From a paper:
Hyaluronan (HA) is an abundant and essential extracellular matrix polysaccharide in vertebrates. It is synthesized from UDP-activated monosaccharides by HA synthase (HAS), a membrane-integrated processive glycosyltransferase (GT) of family-2 by the CAZy classification. HAS performs two functions: it synthesizes HA via a cytosolic catalytic domain and translocates the nascent HA polymer across the plasma membrane through a channel formed by its own membrane-spanning segment.
To our surprise, careful sorting of the UDP-GlcA supplemented cryo EM dataset revealed a CvHAS subpopulation that was not bound to the substrate, but, instead, a [name] molecule near the active site. The first glucosyl unit of the maltoside moiety stacks against Trp342 at the acceptor site. Relative to the HA disaccharide-bound state, the reducing end glucosyl unit of [name] is shifted toward the TM channel by about 2 Å. In this position, its C6 hydroxyl group is in hydrogen bonding distance to Ser345, and the ring oxygen interacts with the guanidinium group of Arg303, which is about 3.1 Å away. Additionally, a previously described ‘switch’ loop (residues 267–271) at the back of the substrate binding groove, moves approximately 3.6 Å away from the maltose moiety relative to the HA disaccharide-bound structure. Strikingly, [name]’s dodecyl alkyl chain extends into a hydrophobic tunnel that is formed by CvHAS’ transmembrane region. The tunnel is formed by Interface Helices two and three as well as TM helix 3. [name]’s dodecyl tail, which likely mimics a phospholipid acyl chain, seals off a lateral connection to the active site. In the resolved position, [name] blocks a site critical for HAS function.
Author numbering:
A (entry chain A): 38 to 291, 300 to 449, 470 to 552
B (entry chain B): 1 to 124
C (entry chain C): 2 to 121
The structure:
């Protein structure tokens, strides 16, 4: 029974991942074939770049603005920078914008989406000049809607680029997010790659490879069938007609970009993900903040599940993959929970050692593929993501399920999960307190657990050596620290 | 520590069967490797059979295909089923238990908790 | 951004000149680097422009004869004027335009806020 369950877990985890790898590779081949036909110095889609932010680091906001300005795309109509706030502290963003761009900061007294006349011409007069708006703080959706209306008042603008206030774009990110829109009349959105640059912490180092996997594999797989989720945010291109069609139902809903993407998909429109457009953002360095962020992400995903399933019904035989993935995530969560619960109350050393060895092996295979794809030996740190998942995501999923003092609603379930895991480990240790070197099964269990501990210790020591030698830092991170030292 | 009390025995004619049971009155029986030893009237103790904490059956020579050892952990017992007796199998059968031990499961000194012994005899 | 241009002098009829404009200060790959000519009298005359990353826009009077190149690594650009004529020898400026106020191509000297010193 235990062997059958472990084999089922192994196949269930390593078969969908292999299928996703194959689909992402085929999406990469399709996009490469599309790009190989792109004429040199191609600029046919007029683009307005939208930056929506709220009290970002003055250094990182300046880096984002400079990365936008230092972009090689030849057809950029305008830059729209919307700031969720007109308070005294929110003027720092305007000052940074004036440092990097013109003195066209506007402070309307109203939020554009909460007015009888929502046209961008009510708060703007010239579409040629880059614009900065200081609008009252309502949310990411309201600032994004103001940016959409400011971009839509120029009839010559064909597409729109959404980036975060902290995204350091590559010199060809805009070109590679806007090119796929012209390769298919039914493609109304493109998702770009987001890369974590601040790999100076054990959590951020693993979150960087989690982002790499979840973008490359898990979005090329969706883009093969052209049903990518969560487009926009750090980097994403939207056609102007589709946003003109879907902005009102999206803003009048009773910012995660999930509902915007589902509004695109519910109308039968294709969405691709390009791995050749890269924008650099950061990740939380704190475990607890990561826990609350993942709780919010899981709450958003669980809220937009019926709408996602309905969206993956408008595609005749496509969208079956989207529905299968939506069911697979739930089935995987409950499979992991059931496996841990079963092997935790039985206190069988053979089963626990087999489970940890199989999980380590499958994560080693996944990390090997990640290293091959990224050409980076640091992708083997992803074997340590098992701890991050088991100790931050499962509490996050349970909290999202249960919440849909302020400390209790955020961390009580996490602390209870930690206490339960500790109690299960202690019970398994005290229920199997014996030594028998004459038994081959006990020898196998002890040697397996000791080898697993030695492996994880060696990986941790390698990470520590890299941290001391600053070998874990991305080149952009080294550049950013060097720039910060002297401002 | 486990206190081992043994049952079974009696007389068998030839080519028959028997069962010897050993109940342990300790605390954590499922962690104890158990063993059955025989002592001939004019010889020393010999390892006959054994079962590990994770069930793994060991049998000696002239015993592999005839005996069968099992353990119950709900009722803390270890049982040896001698399904084919020969006149050489007339010996006192003891049960031994251990929790911590090395590679040697055969020597009398490998097990620290011992039973009293049930006389098992077969007459021609 | 400080622009300094070198190269230029007396040329006898048809020939070739190479003017190098070096920029002190980072360019943003969206700043249109141009060359403007000022004959004795007249006004500033646009002769060439190109964005710092990629592009190209040559004046009608110089189209075909003048070649515009950008190093993009040493922060210098070069203008090669081949098959010279007596009517274009006075002054070249190699101005710069920043895509801060707007991204619109200008071709007018007013839109260039950084200029060099006159070079024959
Ligand atoms: C009291 C002390 C002495 C020990 C208590 C902690 C252990 C009981 C914990 C620490 C590490 C835990 C493991 C860490 C990671 C995983 C991965 C998890 O599988 C995954 O989530 C990986 C997903 C993938 O394979 O990609 C299954 C549970 C398991 C084995 C956990 C089982 C319980 C372990 C051994
Ligand atoms: C009953 C089943 C129990 C739970 C099991 C299934 C739960 C699965 C949860 C999947 C969550 C992963 O989905 C995650 O969602 C969040 C928002 O929703 C997205 O997050 C997106 O929005 C946020 C904020 O705008 C941005 O910072 C982030 O850059 C962007 O990508 C993640 O990119 C996507 O990967
Ligand atoms: Mn930030
Ligand atoms: Mn960020």
């Amino acid at each position: 029974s235990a062997v059958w369950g472990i084999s089922v877990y192994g196949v269930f985890v390593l078969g969908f991942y292999i299928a996703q790898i194959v689909f992402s590779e085929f999406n990469r081949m399709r996009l490469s074939d599309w790009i190989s036909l792109r004429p040199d110095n191609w600029n046919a889609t007029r683009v307005a770049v939208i930056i929506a932010g709220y009290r970002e680091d003055p250094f990182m906001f300046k880096k984002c603005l400079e990365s936008v300005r230092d972009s090689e795309y030849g057809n950029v109509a305008r830059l729209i920078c919307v700031i969720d706030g007109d308070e005294e502290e929110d003027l720092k963003m305007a000052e940074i914008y004036k440092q990097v761009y013109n003195d066209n900061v506007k402070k309307p007294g109203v939020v554009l989406c909460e007015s009888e006349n929502k046209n961008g011409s009510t708060i703007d007069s010239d579409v040629s000049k880059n614009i900065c708006i200081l609008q009252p703080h309502r949310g990411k959706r309201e600032s994004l809607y103001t940016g959409f209306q400011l971009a839509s008042m120029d009839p010559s603008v064909h597409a729109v680029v959404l980036i975060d206030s902290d995204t350091v774009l590559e010199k060809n990110a805009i070109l590679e997010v806007v090119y796929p829109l012209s390769c298919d009349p039914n493609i109304k959105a493109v998702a770009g790659e987001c890369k974590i640059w601040n790999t100076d912490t054990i959590l951020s180092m693993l979150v960087s490879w989690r982002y790499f996997s979840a973008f490359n594999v898990e979005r090329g797989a969706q883009s093969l069938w052209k049903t990518v989720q969560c487009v926009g945010g750090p980097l994403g291109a939207y056609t102007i007609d589709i946003i003109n069609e879907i902005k009102d139902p999206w803003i009048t809903q009773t910012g995660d970009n999930r509902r915007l993407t589902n509004e695109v998909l519910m109308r039968g429109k294709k969405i691709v993900y390009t791995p050749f457009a890269v924008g650099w953002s950061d990740s939380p360095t704190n475990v607890m903040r990561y826990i609350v962020q993942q709780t919010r992400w899981s709450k958003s995903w669980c809220r937009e599940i019926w709408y996602t399933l309905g969206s993956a019904w408008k595609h005749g035989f496509s969208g079956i993959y989207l529905a299968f993935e939506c069911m697979y995530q739930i089935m995987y969560f409950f499979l992991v929970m059931y496996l841990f619960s079963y092997i935790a109350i039985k206190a069988d050393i053979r089963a626990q050692t087999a489970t940890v060895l199989v999980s380590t092996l499958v994560t080693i295979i996944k990390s090997s593929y990640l290293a091959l794809r990224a050409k980076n030996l640091k992708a083997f740190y992803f074997v340590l993501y098992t701890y991050v998942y088991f100790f931050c995501m499962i509490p996050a999923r349970i909290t999202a399920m249960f919440t849909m003092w302020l400390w209790a609603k955020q961390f009580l379930i996490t602390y209870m999960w930690w206490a339960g895991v500790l109690a299960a480990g202690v019970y398994s240790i005290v229920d199997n307190w014996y030594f028998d070197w004459a038994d081959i099964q006990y020898r196998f269990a002890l040697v397996g657990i000791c080898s697993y501990l030695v492996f994880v210790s060696i990986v941790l020591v390698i990470y520590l050596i890299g941290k001391i030698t600053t070998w874990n830092y991305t080149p952009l991170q080294k550049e950013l620290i060097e720039e910060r030292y002297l401002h | 520590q486990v206190q081992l009390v043994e049952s079974g025995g009696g007389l068998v004619q030839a080519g028959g069967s028997l069962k010897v049971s050993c109940a342990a009155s300790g605390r954590a029986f499922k962690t104890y490797r158990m063993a059955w030893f025989r002592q001939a009237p004019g010889k020393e103790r010999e390892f006959v059979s054994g079962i590990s904490a994770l069930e793994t059956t060991y049998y000696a020579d002239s015993v592999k295909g005839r005996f069968t050892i099992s353990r119950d952990n709900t009722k803390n017992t270890v049982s040896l089923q001698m399904d084919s007796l020969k006149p050489e199998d007339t010996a006192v059968y003891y049960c031994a238990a251990r929790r911590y031990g090395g590679t040697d499961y055969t020597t009398t000194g490998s097990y620290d908790y011992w039973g009293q012994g049930t006389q098992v005899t077969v007459s021609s | 951004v400080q622009l300094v241009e070198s190269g230029g002098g007396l040329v006898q009829a048809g020939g070739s000149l190479r003017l190098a404009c070096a920029a002190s200060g980072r360019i943003f790959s969206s700043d249109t680097l141009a060359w403007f000519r000022r004959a004795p009298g007249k006004e500033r005359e646009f002769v060439a422009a190109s964005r710092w990353s990629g592009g190209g826009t040559d004046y009608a009077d110089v189209k075909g004869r003048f070649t515009f190149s950008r190093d993009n690594t040493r922060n210098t650009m070069c203008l090669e004027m081949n098959s010279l004529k007596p009517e274009d020898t006075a002054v070249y400026y190699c101005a710069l335009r920043t895509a801060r106020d707007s991204y619109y191509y200008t071709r007018n000297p007013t839109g260039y806020d950084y200029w060099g010193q006159g070079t024959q």
